[PDB]
């Protein structure tokens, strides 16, 4: 501000304020969803030890396929009920 | 008439679904001490 300056630090972005329609218990839930969507906990676990480039590339390939397989599996499960509903 | 019969089904769902949020919302706080 004109008198006091804003504290611009990584925590400034991870801040959630209490207002009329949002109480302390409500700001905690919003803080947990954003901290989860941004995968802050996963980074703390991956930055604890060093993973050389080859191991990181191969770990991503295993996790990226399980994500496609799981996403393609949910589409087949729900496509099965679209056909069952039609009576096939 | 078909809309009436279908609107009622929604009313029952909304009435039964809103009770879930208000109950789970009020119970969010750990006020079980009953001070």
């Amino acid at each position: 501000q004109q008198e006091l300056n804003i504290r611009l630090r990584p925590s400034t972005g991870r801040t959630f304020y209490v207002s009329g329609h949002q109480d302390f218990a409500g700001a905690l839930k919003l803080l947990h969803r954003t901290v989860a969507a941004n995968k802050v906990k996963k980074d703390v676990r991956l930055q604890r030890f060093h993973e050389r480039p080859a191991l990181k590339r191969k770990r991503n390939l295993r996790e990226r396929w399980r994500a496609r397989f799981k996403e393609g599996f949910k589409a087949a499960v729900n496509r099965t009920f679209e056909l069952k509903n039609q009576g096939w | 008439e078909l809309e009436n019969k279908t609107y009622e089904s929604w009313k029952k769902w909304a009435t039964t679904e809103i009770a879930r949020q208000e109950s789970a919302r009020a119970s969010m706080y750990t006020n079980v001490v009953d001070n």
Binding site: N85, W88 | E3, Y7, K11
Partner: protein
């Protein structure tokens, strides 16, 4: 030229199915939901029907017979086919009653579709021979270009900044040579109008440098040039310097093929009460009450704004089947986005009683037990 087998398939019924038309256009930059989808503004697939003796067998003229559980039992046999045979070796179909019965419920209102008006209410049919025309001659001037409804060029105000650049690069840029010829044909009319007006007291029509100068003269008056450019690219009028150039021309026929009546100027002759003052009322359902401060009502399956005037102000869970209101459909029109918009108005009191009397819902019948 074609084998007898190919000649039969051409005139076949399954070959006459219309292609799937694009869905009703929506906000291009706005977000939507891709998993779930509700009823569309207007239908995109053809609704199919069978004989009652064939429906019991599941035969719908398709590749395979349809399941009986999801196609039998109802009153109106209607089906929409998305793929006659999908990668699952099944006919991806769905019920077609959401639009098949919305058409019958709308036509039950017995109201035409009028041209959009501006705000002296003058409801003019959209099937008039002077306005409803699509074939035009190259001699077609500008004053009569406002009556049309089907233009070849796009509406510049409706395009996005991206679609407009693609248009300037692939449609108007390679038409410069053709436009210069279009001017020469005008010069043929400019040199003959002054050269043949005194004979009752054609020109070469091929020039190269004269055209370059004539265009410069028009730089002082930009309006006369836009009318000349739009007439060539067949652009829909934009501003008055008239045919509702606010939201743009309609992407379909002004009627959209939902109603073909040309006027509502008629009286309903009641069996006992003689002619009526207004058309019979229609009961509507209240959706999204004011408490956006605007209300929405469902009339014959279409959503419209509530009458300009409670039940439409605050939600009431005590009312069974939701809040309902008797109204009268004054005007119906088709906007530029293909939607059907109704200008509903509140219904009178005596009329709702007359309508309820026939169906047996009036409490105090106006006949017999009405001393005053």
């Amino acid at each position: 030229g074609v084998s007898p087998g190919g000649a039969l398939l051409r005139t076949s019924r399954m070959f006459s199915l219309p292609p799937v038309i694009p869905p009703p256009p929506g906000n291009k930059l706005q977000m939507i939901s891709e998993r779930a989808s509700a009823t569309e503004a207007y239908p995109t697939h053809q609704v199919l029907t069978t004989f009652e003796s064939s429906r019991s067998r599941g035969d719908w003229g398709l590749k395979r017979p349809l399941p009986l559980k999801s196609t039998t039992g109802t009153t109106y046999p209607m089906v929409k086919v998305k793929e006659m045979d999908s990668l699952e070796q099944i006919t991806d179909f769905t019920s077609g009653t959401q639009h098949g019965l919305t058409l019958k419920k709308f036509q039950a209102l017995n109201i035409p579709i009028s041209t959009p008006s501006e705000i002296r209410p003058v409801q003019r049919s959209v099937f008039e021979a002077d306005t409803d025309v699509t074939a035009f001659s190259p001699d077609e001037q500008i004053q009569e270009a406002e009556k049309r409804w089907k233009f070849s060029g796009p509406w510049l105000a409706g395009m996005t900044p991206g679609e407009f650049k693609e248009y300037l690069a692939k449609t108007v840029r390679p038409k410069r040579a053709e436009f210069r010829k279009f001017i020469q044909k005008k010069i043929a009319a400019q040199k003959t109008e002054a050269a043949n007006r005194e004979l009752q007291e054609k020109p070469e029509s091929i020039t190269d440098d004269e055209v370059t100068e004539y265009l410069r003269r028009l730089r002082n008056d930009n309006q006369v040039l836009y009318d000349l450019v739009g007439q060539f690219l067949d652009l829909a009028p934009l501003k008055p310097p008239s045919p509702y150039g606010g939201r743009g021309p309609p992407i379909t026929h002004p009627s959209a093929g939902i109603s073909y009546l040309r006027t509502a100027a008629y009286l309903n002759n009641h069996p006992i009460y003689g002619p009526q003052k207004s058309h019979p009322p229609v009961q509507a359902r209240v959706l999204k009450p004011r408490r956006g401060n605007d209300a929405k009502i469902g009339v014959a399956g279409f959503v419209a704004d509530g009458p300009l005037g409670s039940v439409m102000d605050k939600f009431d869970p005590s009312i069974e089947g939701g809040a309902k209101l008797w109204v009268n459909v004054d005007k119906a029109t088709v906007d530029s986005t293909g939607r059907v918009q109704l200008t509903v108005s509140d219904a009178k009191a005596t009329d709702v009683l007359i309508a309820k009397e026939l169906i047996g819902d009036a409490r105090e019948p106006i006949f017999g037990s009405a001393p005053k």
